[PDB]
Design a protein around this nucleic acid. Structure first.
Lengths: 93, 46, 271
RNA sequence: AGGACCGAACCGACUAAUGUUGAAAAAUUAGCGGAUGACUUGUGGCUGGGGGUGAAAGGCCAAUCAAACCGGGAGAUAGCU
RNA sequence: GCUCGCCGGAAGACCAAGGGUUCCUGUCCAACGUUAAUCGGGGCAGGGUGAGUCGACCCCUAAGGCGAGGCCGAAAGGCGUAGUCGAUGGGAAACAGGUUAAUAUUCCUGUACUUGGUGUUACUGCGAAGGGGGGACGGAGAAGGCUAUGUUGGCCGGGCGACGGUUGUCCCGGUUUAAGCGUGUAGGCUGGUUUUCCAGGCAAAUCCGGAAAAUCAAGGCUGAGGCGUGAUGACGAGGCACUACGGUGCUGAAGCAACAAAUGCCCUGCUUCCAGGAAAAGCCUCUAAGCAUCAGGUAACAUCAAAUCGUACCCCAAACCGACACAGGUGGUCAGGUAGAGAAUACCAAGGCGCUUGAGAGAACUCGGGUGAAGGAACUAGGCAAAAUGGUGCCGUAACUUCGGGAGAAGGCACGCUGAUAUGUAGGUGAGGUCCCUCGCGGAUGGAGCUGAAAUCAGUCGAAGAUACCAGCUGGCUGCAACUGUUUAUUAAAAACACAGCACUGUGCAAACACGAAAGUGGACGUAUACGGUGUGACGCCUGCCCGGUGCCGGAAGGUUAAU
């Protein structure tokens, strides 16, 4: 099993957008920003054990950071990871 | 017209990359001069 | 059978083929084949060491039995095959215990023909046996120079070696060169002569034929600049020098043997 | 069948005109040669400087080649400007 | 938004490489954009890339790299065995439909498939850095069977028409459906089965190879496509209801046949030719050591797992390489209509564009073009440039020749449209029916239907019927080079280089020779019918004399002659 100390550090934020919103209200999927080194077994286990719901399957993409600039000083943001967590028929959050 | 720089990442790295500078005496001296000059990127890796 | 091609399209005007209807039209015997990668004339330093080599057709090596070690077991010649690595043809043979091997094909040898290696072999063409058992004045090919080593003399097509003497532990051999050489008499040799003599009668006809045997062009020395070849330069055709290699050593006469180790074994140089 | 014939792709580059502070540090337009072969091309690899490679022109080796580029000896030396 | 023009083997679509947010939405016009800009690949913010099946990673290897020991080398280091890496190659598996502003073989719907783990049950000999098979692989050519795809008819829905006619031999549109599973066909290959024996596959072997018999004449392997199912589902021209007029839902007819047909598939086939055409693993098998009522193997069922990284967007380009939003360069994939031999060319479809300065005027002159009286190379260094020729069929065709050519020599004639032969022929395809059955994806007959050259005769139109585009100028004498090729990237493509062929010469294998302080490597896993060097340069007739000089080869007597 995955230890609970690992399993708390994985989920990072709920992702709020309109693709996320239509995924919830149309296909049971909650979209959430996860740890960059988090595997699909860790995300599945962490939503099973931290929101106490039943997860059908996880799909993970990794989002690349945008090169912004302040003034005349550039900088890339930071890569993050986004997990499309497809729940079962019985869920709320 | 076909210019000289026809890029390929795999040849860039196999040729001038870090594992290929470290692979020999003189490339390690190259890295030593780039570190000593103090250089933001040593090799061309990415 | 040599055949002049009819002169449709130059390039075919001067070709003479050497066709052989008794060669096997088909794939060679597979577990006696191996990879033979082409080099380009270039050593482990990458450099061109032998010039004029490169390109040509892909070839697979055929392990030809030059040693002929299966003594006393007869072998029937299964077929004859084209070998790209040699001038001669190779015969695929089948021993009585179910082992196939390729040998160099001697002159008269056809399919369905008994050959036999060893000391008590009959003297007839195809039988490898030591030269203390071969009669003097017999044509013999695939000669060993050291006992047990493998054949190295008279392997190229239409080539034989005549045994002229048996003085003691040595046999004096008239090599195809014209050279008289002493060989130890325990060295095996195969009877007869090796058999594609008409190989020398083919004429190739065009430039691309040389190209497809892997022979790149030869730039002649006098066509170059002086930095390139000692012959070089000169305002139209201009030779004026004693003819040399590209490294300055005299061509046209100058003897380049220095061994001193194998001079014991040379009875008379060639002429 | 053919280093076969005509001819597109494809490779090339014979002529002319334009261009020549170009649209382009070598091209465009109209014709032109090869076009199953000694062809052409992709990806990778190997050869290195008095060295490579060269169907040979002193050609090519990163718009550089009768000896690359970078750094150093080095503020070479300059009865010359 | 309506018209107009351009590309349409691309100026459309999909990628690889390369780039790296340029993608999509809102917002701003300072600078960037060769002008203005409300617009933008610009600024700012937000959003966006979803995989057991696609690709990478992974398993295996080529060229080649690195390389424990090792051999070698003043040192650095060179080479290399075991090994280990290295794709551009070999290895398991997913398709259709729908959806987002922006992803989709990834999400959703439906239907699937693959490989491992574990468990149960039934049977059971399993077991390798080892043996065998297989993987496993050339160029060209030829058909045959198909399909993608298209055309026409039928069917279904809609229209009867701004200007003469248009209820019909009329017009517009649609007529689509996959993987998987089942069947096993047109082909292609091979005789099959049983028993005994063996100097081979380092050992063993029931596997492979081999040698005997005996019997049967068939079995096996492979294989496009079709057919059935998937699918009483989806999709579907269009209508219906609301309509932030952007669309959003609902409903939805027919959904067939004939012919033509690939450069795709059977085909890694078949025929043929020399120039003789990767490897290793997965895969199938054989056993050795061992384990043998255990482990393991096989089969069925159930259950679990299939991680990680890529996925946006451009990709013949305003996003890559060219300093530029540069008339240049850049690999693969798809490839509709009409005419055409065709991927040429013309005009078009799908789709995409109008090239990020415009408005005038209508001088010289320059550039790109059109036409030209009479003449017709007089131009000029030179017919440079332009003009001309140009297709298919048939007739016809010289010198010379290596007997192949020359030759498309040269030079001519025919060509549209309509009608008849013949309400479209010869030919191709071929239904229903009929006959037989080793009964079906069968063969024989039969010709409905579809497709359809080419020729002759008759007529008719125009100045002209290869009407556009496309598409040889021809002949005579001669120098050089035999020929195809190669070369001065960027003023020289040539008679120069190359070449087949010839000769001379070296080279006996630890070969000469070359790269290398050496080890070693190439020569070559070649062996004098071979290899290296040099010259000449197809072929034909030939290649004369000179060995005093320089070189080379040979000789050893004498003279001179180093280190010692």
């Amino acid at each position: 099993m995955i230890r609970e100390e690992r399993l708390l550090k994985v989920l990072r934020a709920p992702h709020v957008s309109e693709k996320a919103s239509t995924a919830m209200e149309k296909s049971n999927t909650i979209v959430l920003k996860v740890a960059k080194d988090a595997t699909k077994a860790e995300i599945k286990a962490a939503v099973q054990k931290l929101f106490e719901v039943e997860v059908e399957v996880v799909n993970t993409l990794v989002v690349k950071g945008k090169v912004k600039r302040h003034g005349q000083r550039i900088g890339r943001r930071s890569d993050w990871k986004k997990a499309y967590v497809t729940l079962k028929e019985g869920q709320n959050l | 017209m076909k210019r000289t720089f026809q890029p390929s990442v795999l040849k860039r790295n196999r040729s001038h990359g870090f594992r290929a500078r470290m692979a020999t005496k003189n490339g390690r001296q190259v890295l030593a001069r780039r570190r000593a000059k103090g250089r933001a990127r040593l090799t061309v890796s990415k | 059978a040599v055949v002049k091609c009819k002169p449709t399209s130059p390039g075919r005007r001067h070709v003479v083929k050497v066709v052989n209807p008794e060669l096997h039209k088909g794939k060679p015997f597979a577990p006696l084949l191996e990879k033979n990668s082409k080099s380009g004339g270039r050593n482990n330093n990458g450099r061109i060491t032998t010039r004029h080599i490169g390109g040509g057709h892909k070839q697979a090596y055929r392990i030809v039995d030059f040693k002929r070690n299966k003594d006393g077991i007869p072998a029937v010649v299964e077929r004859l095959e084209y070998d790209p690595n040699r001038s001669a043809n190779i015969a695929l043979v089948l021993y009585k215990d179910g082992e196939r091997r390729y040998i160099l094909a001697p002159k008269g040898l056809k399919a369905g023909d008994q050959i036999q290696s060893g000391v008590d072999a009959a003297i007839k063409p195809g039988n490898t046996l030591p030269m203390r058992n071969i009669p003097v004045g017999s044509t013999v090919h695939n000669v060993e120079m050291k006992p047990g080593k493998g054949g190295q003399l008279a392997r190229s097509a239409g080539t034989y070696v005549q045994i002229v003497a048996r003085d003691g532990a040595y046999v004096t051999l008239r090599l195809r060169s014209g050279e008289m050489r002493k060989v130890e008499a325990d060295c095996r040799a195969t009877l007869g002569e090796v058999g594609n003599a008409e190989h020398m009668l083919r004429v190739l006809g065009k430039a691309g034929a040389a190209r497809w045997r892997g022979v790149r062009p030869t730039v002649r020395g006098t066509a170059m600049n002086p930095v390139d070849h000692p012959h070089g330069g000169g305002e139209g055709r201009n030779f004026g020098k004693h003819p040399v290699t590209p490294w300055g050593v005299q061509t046209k006469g100058k003897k380049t043997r220095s061994n001193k180790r194998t001079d014991k074994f040379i009875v008379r140089r060639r002429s």
